[PDB]
Design a protein around this ligand. Structure first.
Ligand SMILES: *Cc1c(COP(=O)(O)O)cnc(C)c1O
Ligand SMILES: *Cc1c(COP(=O)(O)O)cnc(C)c1O
Lengths: 347, 347
């Protein structure tokens, strides 16, 4: 009434909710147990894992369940770093990553790791060439997001993956905003690890995944040590309802825009604005800078939309979006800038 | 039909399921957002946090949401350890902890930390005196579980907490099996950190918590770095349905045994057995060693109960429960030993 903040979270699809229901009280075993009720949960988990693997062009065993892209990003990064506590090393990322990536890299710096935060162009774009130029003898990970959560910018992951392949450096991508929206083939894009989030694709909150190439033989240091779940890479009892719901979300991901809401497209033009990353953004995120404070006032008074201006930490520090300032907007411009996002769909 | 494996997981209460429902598709904002829908989620999260705090005699801010006791155990342990990567140090735990604790401590050993795994008595008991005798100049954490998940053994956490207090060593307890069943006051027991799991108390899977004394000023290293959630201690978008459901579970935790099922008590005596930790175990977990293989055969053919014999890793290695062998049972005895567990309730 009206919600235009889909890049922040999405509503659980009816089919997803239904599919979760039998695993609440009807059949509720710990999937680790040795009896038939655990068997049933395990089979349902297998189906979801296969659906996710299929969509990424991966093998089922290469899908590690987590609780979301934040935990996934942490596992990808710390999983490699924590095998290097003595010799340390260098990581390449961007300055416009989600704050979870920025903050995990900040922590790594605090324990002696070196990190380059690549600065975007005004378009929001990170180039493969800049990745290539940042490479050092001790670079051990390149992490670059696929689609930017504030701007919608589609990054050149294939070209970046090519650079990482040419140097035999692991390539991770935060795909929380691209998973299901954009077709992703892990081999075609030379991806080693990929993060995704359930509640960004009409799935439930509290679930996501990390693709890990050759997970069975992976030397990644587990973030959560546990009882053997997820090939020993990710501990904690498998939350069968959340896993099942995630599979259903992926399977029934909307194929057409964004329904009727994404028109929208006939409203927004009654206003004067500049779209940030306008030639490089997905159709479902419109990060827009209105022309002046008077236009902002008109827009917000006429439209009672729930939208977004930047990260929570920026709100707390009373500063503009880190993303907006990285792309070169002034503080005054940032004040007039809003992310209006629409129901995700394929394409 | 019939499920006697409650120590492994429990069925979500009707009130818990209902309470989750409006946060799936009716109101589904990211609680980090700045608008009214996030406000509503945040308020509901606050209520659950307060319910949990109240039950532990803690302050609301001292409750850190996680996805379960595994993630909580990892945060408690690695959160302290990762501030010591250079000087390392010593940790005291038991050899009969849940495998998540054993495996995180094993990892710490692999990066240069020293760990003492205290061996139980035949009763399953760990003593405060043994903790005291294991203390070293560089001991920086004592972690001992409150109630054992295989045996039901109630450990002397107050006495152990007293020892830790007398040395100004942090005391953590894995309370996944004791939370709500046994009255826990964090100040009375001198607890610094405490792990709990939602699906052990008729809550949903994928949620738990870590009590952290003085969380606001805690120097714990976050396991999941994120956008600022949980006072910066635990990243990832707050899963409002799971958090709300956990509060409801705690609030309506059963007050009387375990209903009718826990009779049970009139069945079990038709069989010949010895109860492990029989003088020290909760009424709702019966870890029992039948007299001979013939008695086992009689019991299993007559009763189609879903029960448990030991951890998943022990099943995979084709070895007896680590818990059972630690308490001194032979492999043959372990073969005849089953954990039969009942609906949890207060007292
Ligand atoms: C939402 C998001 C995250 C965090 O994912 P959660 O599942 O909410 O923890 C990370 N990266 C990007 C790009 C996102 O949009
Ligand atoms: C279940 C359990 C755990 C693990 O908790 P999850 O929430 O299932 O990850 C840890 N310790 C004990 C004692 C348990 O019973």
């Amino acid at each position: 009434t009206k919600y235009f903040d889909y890049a922040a979270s999405t509503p659980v699809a009816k089919g997803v909710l239904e599919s979760m229901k039998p695993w609440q009280s009807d059949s509720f075993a710990n999937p680790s147990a040795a009896h038939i009720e655990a068997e049933k949960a395990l089979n349902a988990i297998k189906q979801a894992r296969e659906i996710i693997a299929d969509t990424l062009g991966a093998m089922p065993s290469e899908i590690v369940f987590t609780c979301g892209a934040s935990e996934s990003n942490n596992l990808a990064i710390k999983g490699l770093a924590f095998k290097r506590l003595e010799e340390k090393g260098h990581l390449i990322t961007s300055s416009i990553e989600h704050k979870c990536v920025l903050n995990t890299c900040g922590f790594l710096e605090s324990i002696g790791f070196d990190v380059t935060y690549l600065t975007p162009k005004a378009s929001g774009l990170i180039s493969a060439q800049q990745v290539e130029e940042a490479i050092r003898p001790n670079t051990f990970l390149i992490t670059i997001h696929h689609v930017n959560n504030e701007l919608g910018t589609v990054q050149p992951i294939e070209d970046i993956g090519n650079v990482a392949f040419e140097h035999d450096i692991p390539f991770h991508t935060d795909a929380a905003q691209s998973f299901c929206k954009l077709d992703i083939d892990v081999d075609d894009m030379n991806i080693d690890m990929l993060s995704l989030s359930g509640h960004k694709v009409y799935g439930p909150k509290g679930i996501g995944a990390l693709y890990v190439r050759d997970a069975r033989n992976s030397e990644l240091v587990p973030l959560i040590h546990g009882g053997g779940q997820e090939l020993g890479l990710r501990g904690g009892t498998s939350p069968t309802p959340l896993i099942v719901g995630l599979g259903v979300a992926v399977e029934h991901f909307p194929s057409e825009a964004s329904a009727q809401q994404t028109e929208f497209e006939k409203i927004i033009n009654e206003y004067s604005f500049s779209r940030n990353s306008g030639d490089n953004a997905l159709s479902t995120t419109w990060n827009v800078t209105f022309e002046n404070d008077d236009e902002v006032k008109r827009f917000t008074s006429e439209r009672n939309w729930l939208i977004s201006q930047g990260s929570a930490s920026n709100a707390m520090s009373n500063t503009p979006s880190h993303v907006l300032t990285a792309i070169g907007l002034s503080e005054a411009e940032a004040r007039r800038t809003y992310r209006i996002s629409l129901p995700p769909y394929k394409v």
